[PDB]
């Protein structure tokens, strides 16, 4: 259900942009009429693509994936250690001699 | 849309009516035994669509109505919501005498069709007065309680809904009479003088899938939102105030211990599982987005 | 590389054998093998584990056991003196270089580390080298700071899968 | 904009008169790109003659930067003010159409200026006149630009960007695979839990034996 809502909001972005890129390339061909300026704000969407590829950015993306992987380290021990606690309660019952 | 099931899903048996088991769980009376017995109370979609129109389509005056359903095991499903004709002042309603007429004559007319729930609770809509059952819905709900057993007071607040941009759905039951059993005061202050007498319910929602498919294609500009959700971000304190619950849960659990480390497991596998949501949403975007003409 | 391949070669020929008493030139590739890979305890106990005949048999386990000895007390200018004062047998010979190529890296690795102001006297016994030697190399290099005062200034300047694995695991 | 009403009223001349217009276009403020002006017949038959300097200044407006411009000083006819502010507000756009973090020691560089605040103020001017927006920064010397107009391109460059975007669009198309394949696997790990599940069923079968003992 989480990634259901990703790969739509992906393709229904994907769908944009080929139909864009379909555009161009129609404009490129000269089966249609040139327009000067959907081609120029063309080249201003196309030349921003890398967005925010600064090292402060690489910094903070890695503390939040450390942060999220300790969240997840913290949240597994818990839950295999009520495991563990059922493991135990059914070996002290039917293996234990009363 | 493909590469899964299209027949009937495993969120439509919540749909299902069955009479015979109710029939059962009705003759049975389980509710008498252990009196802090309904803890969940699962609302349809369409009954809290209509409850909320409803109630912001009234103004700053009250009104209310009844809610259809039926009980399971520990759980009270309401699945549609019938307003009602009455004329209500700013602060209290009354429902004199068009009202029961409607009640009767609207159960008939939905069995003639085909609805085969019965009546399961009552509603009533504070303007802007906060979500808590006042001296009058108490009287009233233990009345309803004291002979049509199965019953749940729902609240809802429509100014406050409507300012703030969140439901405030209440679903509370009444104790009988006689029945006494840095931290904020607000668990007493929200609610009135009667706050001893009756106690809240865990209020979830539900919908068919033919509901989520139609919600599905509902609009086709909220993918921004999704692709710059930003997520992890702005449910920071959520994530904090269930972590400090959790251990709360944690502590209680091992004091006991020495079956209340389930539900203490659960919250620490929900509470994961978001972050864990929230990581693998930032991880999708910067694969999407960052790693192009490098 | 080639000393994984040998360290495997060795052990296999320890492992299974027949005749049960090893030729000293096998022992003593395994000396100078354990030695490379800078593992004293394992160097040790095979030094231990060697009978005395054996030992007796030729002076090439005497002098890599010297070797070892000196490497023990950390005393580098000693390493040096004895990587070179003696001679050795053929089968031995392309790894002791390689041998006094990684004690060199790792001098200039511990001088790197754990120093920031250090005599240039001090650095030349670390290397085993002739001062102005070092002091060239290491104007070429750049970790270095100036004359006279005689101190060298050494500084040092599919995670889909992973999370989905871990949430499926936690829903149970 | 402003260039069609230029471009309307200098439809139906030529000669000199075509040169004066193009000096007043290169001198009209709020004009930053002249794309539809290039295509008109009386521009283009303008390169025969001994006018030819006119046409030249106007690519290099069109598509060169200040560096270029320095680079044939002499050939090209003298400038005024404006036109010289206008070329270095397209050279701060060219450059930070390539990187969105631009150095200080490169901007003084290229715009060939010598004191900081001549440089912070031409800046200031440019995100002025709204071609480009950003912040400047002299902790760190930089400048940090968040959005900046699209120049002219030529005809023949098209392509290229076309390959740009052709990029990105496998990109998405990857990244939505992935996608799939994650969910298949999660649903198999389910559907082989409730296969264990199943085994406890076979657990009361067991049950049903110390009925008879």
Same mark, same amino acid.
């Given at each position: 259900?989480?990634? #259901?809502?990703?790969?739509?909001? #992906?393709?229904?972005?994907?769908?944009?942009?080929?139909? #864009?890129?379909?555009?161009?390339?129609?404009?490129?061909?000269?089966?249609?009429?040139?327009?000067?300026? #959907?081609?120029?704000?063309?080249?201003?969407?196309?030349?921003?693509?890398?967005?925010?590829?600064?090292?402060?950015?690489?910094?903070?993306?890695?503390?939040?994936? +450390?942060?999220?992987?300790?969240?997840?380290?913290?949240?597994?021990?818990?839950?295999?250690?009520?495991?563990?606690?059922?493991?135990?309660?059914?070996? +002290?019952?039917?293996?234990?001699?009363? | 849309?493909?590469?899964?099931?299209?027949?009937?899903?495993?969120?439509?048996?919540? *749909?299902?009516? %069955?009479?015979?088991?109710?029939?059962?769980?009705?003759?049975?009376?389980?509710?008498?035994?252990?009196?802090?017995?309904?803890?969940?109370?699962?609302?349809?979609?369409?009954?809290?669509?209509?409850?909320?129109?409803?109630?912001?389509?009234?103004?700053?005056?009250?009104?209310? $109505?009844?809610?259809?359903?039926?009980?399971?095991?520990?759980?009270?499903?309401?699945?549609?919501?019938?307003?009602?004709?009455?004329?209500?002042?700013?602060?209290?309603?009354?429902?004199?005498?068009?009202?029961?007429?409607?009640?009767?004559?609207?159960?008939?007319?939905?069995?003639?069709?085909?609805?085969?729930?019965?009546?399961?609770?009552?509603?009533?809509?504070?303007?802007?007065?906060?979500?808590?059952?006042? $001296?009058?819905?108490?009287?009233?709900?233990?009345?309803?309680? !004291?002979?049509?057993?199965?019953?749940?007071?729902?609240?809802?607040?429509?100014?406050?809904?409507?300012?703030? =941009?969140?439901?405030?759905? $209440?679903?509370?039951?009444?104790?009988?009479? =006689?029945?006494?059993?840095?931290?904020?005061?607000?668990?007493?202050?929200?609610?009135?003088?009667?706050?001893?007498? *009756?106690?809240?319910?865990?209020?979830? *929602?539900?919908?068919?899938?033919? %509901?989520?498919?139609?919600?599905?294609?509902?609009?086709?500009?909220?993918?921004?939102?999704?692709?710059?959700?930003?997520?992890?971000?702005?449910?920071? %304190?959520?994530?904090? =105030?269930?972590?400090?619950?959790?251990?709360?849960?944690?502590? !209680?659990?091992?004091? !006991?211990? =020495?079956?209340?480390?389930?539900?203490?497991?659960?919250?620490?596998?929900?509470?994961?599982?978001?972050?864990?949501?929230?990581?693998?949403?930032?991880?999708?975007?910067?694969?999407?987005?960052?790693?192009?003409?490098? | 590389?080639?000393?994984?391949?040998?360290? /495997?070669?060795?052990?296999?020929?320890?492992?299974?054998?027949?005749?049960?008493?090893?030729?000293?030139?096998?022992?003593?590739?395994?000396?100078?093998?354990?030695?490379?890979?800078? /593992?004293?305890?394992?160097?040790?106990?095979?030094?231990?584990?060697?009978?005395?005949?054996?030992?007796?048999?030729? &002076?090439?386990?005497?002098?890599?056991?010297?070797?070892?000895?000196?490497?023990?007390?950390?005393?580098?200018?000693?390493?040096?003196?004895?990587?070179?004062?003696?001679?050795? &047998?053929?089968?031995?010979?392309?790894?002791?270089?390689?041998?006094?190529?990684?004690?060199?890296?790792?001098?200039?690795?511990?001088?790197?580390?754990?120093?920031?102001?250090?005599?240039?006297?001090?650095?030349?016994?670390?290397?085993?080298?002739?001062?102005?030697?070092?002091?060239?190399?290491?104007?070429?290099?750049?970790?270095?700071?100036?004359?006279?005062?005689?101190?060298?200034?050494?500084?040092?300047?599919?995670?889909?899968?992973?999370?989905?694995?871990?949430?499926?695991?936690?829903?149970? | 904009?402003?260039?069609?009403?230029?471009?309307?009223?200098?439809?139906?001349?030529?000669?000199?008169?075509?040169?004066?217009?193009?000096?007043?276009?290169?001198?009209?403020?709020?004009?930053?790109?002249?794309?539809?002006?290039?295509?008109?017949?009386?521009?283009?038959?303008?390169?025969?003659?001994?006018?030819?300097?006119?046409?030249?200044?106007?690519?290099?407006?069109?598509?060169?930067?200040?560096?270029?411009?320095?680079?044939?000083?002499?050939?090209?006819?003298?400038?005024?003010?404006?036109?010289?502010?206008?070329? @270095?507000?397209?050279?701060?756009?060219?450059?930070?159409?390539?990187? @969105?973090?631009?150095?200080?020691?490169?901007?003084?560089?290229?715009?060939?200026?010598?004191?900081?605040?001549?440089?912070?103020?031409?800046?200031?001017?440019?995100?002025?006149?709204?071609?480009?927006?950003?912040?400047?920064?002299?902790?760190?010397?930089?400048?940090?630009?968040?959005?900046?107009?699209?120049?002219?391109?030529?005809? @023949?460059?098209?392509?290229?960007?076309?390959?740009?975007?052709?990029?990105?669009?496998?990109?998405?198309?990857?990244?939505?695979?992935?996608?799939?394949?994650?969910?298949?696997?999660?649903?198999?790990?389910?559907?082989?839990?409730?296969?264990?599940?199943?085994?406890?069923?076979?657990?009361?079968?067991?049950?049903?034996?110390?009925? @008879?003992?």
């Amino acid at each position: 259900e989480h990634l #259901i809502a990703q790969h739509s909001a #992906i393709k229904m972005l994907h769908s944009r942009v080929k139909l #864009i890129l379909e555009y161009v390339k129609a404009s490129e061909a000269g089966e249609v009429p040139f327009n000067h300026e #959907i081609l120029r704000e063309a080249y201003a969407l196309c030349h921003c693509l890398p967005v925010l590829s600064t090292d402060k950015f690489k910094t903070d993306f890695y503390d939040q994936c +450390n942060d999220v992987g300790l969240m997840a380290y913290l949240g597994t021990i818990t839950k295999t250690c009520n495991t563990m606690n059922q493991f135990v309660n059914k070996f +002290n019952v039917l293996y234990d001699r009363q | 849309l493909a590469n899964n099931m299209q027949e009937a899903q495993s969120i439509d048996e919540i *749909y299902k009516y %069955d009479k015979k088991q109710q029939q059962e769980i009705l003759a049975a009376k389980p509710w008498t035994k252990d009196h802090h017995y309904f803890k969940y109370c699962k609302i349809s979609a369409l009954a809290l669509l209509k409850m909320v129109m409803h109630a912001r389509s009234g103004g700053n005056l009250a009104v209310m $109505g009844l809610m259809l359903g039926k009980v399971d095991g520990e759980t009270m499903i309401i699945m549609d919501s019938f307003a009602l004709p009455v004329e209500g002042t700013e602060t209290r309603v009354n429902a004199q005498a068009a009202a029961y007429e409607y009640m009767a004559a609207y159960i008939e007319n939905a069995k003639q069709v085909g609805r085969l729930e019965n009546a399961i609770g009552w509603y009533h809509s504070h303007p802007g007065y906060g979500c808590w059952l006042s $001296g009058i819905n108490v009287s009233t709900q233990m009345l309803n309680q !004291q002979f049509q057993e199965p019953f749940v007071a729902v609240v809802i607040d429509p100014t406050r809904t409507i300012s703030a =941009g969140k439901v405030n759905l $209440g679903a509370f039951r009444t104790y009988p009479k =006689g029945y006494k059993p840095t931290i904020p005061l607000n668990k007493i202050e929200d609610f009135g003088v009667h706050c001893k007498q *009756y106690y809240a319910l865990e209020v979830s *929602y539900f919908k068919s899938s033919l %509901d989520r498919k139609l919600l599905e294609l509902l609009w086709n500009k909220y993918w921004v939102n999704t692709l710059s959700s930003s997520s992890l971000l702005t449910n920071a %304190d959520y994530t904090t =105030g269930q972590v400090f619950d959790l251990s709360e849960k944690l502590e !209680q659990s091992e004091a !006991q211990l =020495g079956d209340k480390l389930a539900k203490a497991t659960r919250d620490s596998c929900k509470t994961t599982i978001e972050a864990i949501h929230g990581l693998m949403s930032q991880v999708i975007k910067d694969k999407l987005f960052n790693q192009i003409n490098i | 590389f080639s000393f994984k391949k040998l360290l /495997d070669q060795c052990e296999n020929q320890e492992l299974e054998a027949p005749g049960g008493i090893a030729t000293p030139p096998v022992y003593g590739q395994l000396l100078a093998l354990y030695l490379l890979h800078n /593992d004293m305890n394992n160097a040790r106990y095979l030094w231990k584990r060697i009978p005395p005949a054996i030992k007796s048999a030729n &002076s090439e386990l005497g002098g890599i056991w010297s070797v070892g000895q000196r490497i023990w007390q950390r005393d580098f200018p000693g390493i040096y003196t004895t990587i070179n004062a003696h001679q050795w &047998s053929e089968t031995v010979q392309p790894i002791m270089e390689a041998l006094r190529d990684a004690t060199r890296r790792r001098a200039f690795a511990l001088v790197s580390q754990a120093y920031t102001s250090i005599i240039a006297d001090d650095f030349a016994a670390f290397v085993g080298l002739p001062v102005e030697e070092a002091v060239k190399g290491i104007l070429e290099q750049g970790w270095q700071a100036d004359s006279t005062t005689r101190m060298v200034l050494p500084r040092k300047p599919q995670q889909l899968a992973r999370l989905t694995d871990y949430v499926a695991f936690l829903e149970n | 904009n402003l260039l069609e009403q230029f471009i309307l009223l200098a439809k139906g001349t030529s000669g000199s008169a075509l040169t004066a217009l193009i000096s007043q276009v290169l001198e009209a403020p709020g004009v930053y790109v002249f794309g539809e002006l290039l295509e008109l017949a009386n521009v283009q038959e303008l390169a025969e003659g001994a006018n030819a300097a006119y046409l030249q200044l106007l690519n290099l407006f069109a598509y060169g930067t200040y560096p270029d411009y320095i680079a044939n000083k002499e050939s090209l006819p003298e400038l005024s003010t404006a036109q010289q502010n206008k070329l @270095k507000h397209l050279t701060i756009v060219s450059l930070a159409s390539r990187m @969105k973090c631009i150095p200080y020691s490169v901007l003084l560089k290229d715009l060939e200026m010598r004191n900081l605040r001549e440089l912070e103020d031409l800046i200031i001017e440019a995100v002025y006149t709204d071609i480009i927006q950003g912040k400047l920064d002299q902790r760190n010397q930089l400048l940090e630009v968040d959005f900046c107009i699209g120049r002219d391109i030529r005809k @023949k460059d098209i392509n290229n960007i076309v390959k740009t975007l052709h990029e990105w669009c496998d990109g998405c198309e990857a990244v939505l695979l992935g996608i799939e394949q994650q969910v298949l696997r999660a649903n198999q790990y389910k559907e082989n839990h409730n296969r264990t599940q199943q085994q406890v069923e076979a657990e009361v079968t067991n049950i049903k034996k110390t009925l @008879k003992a």
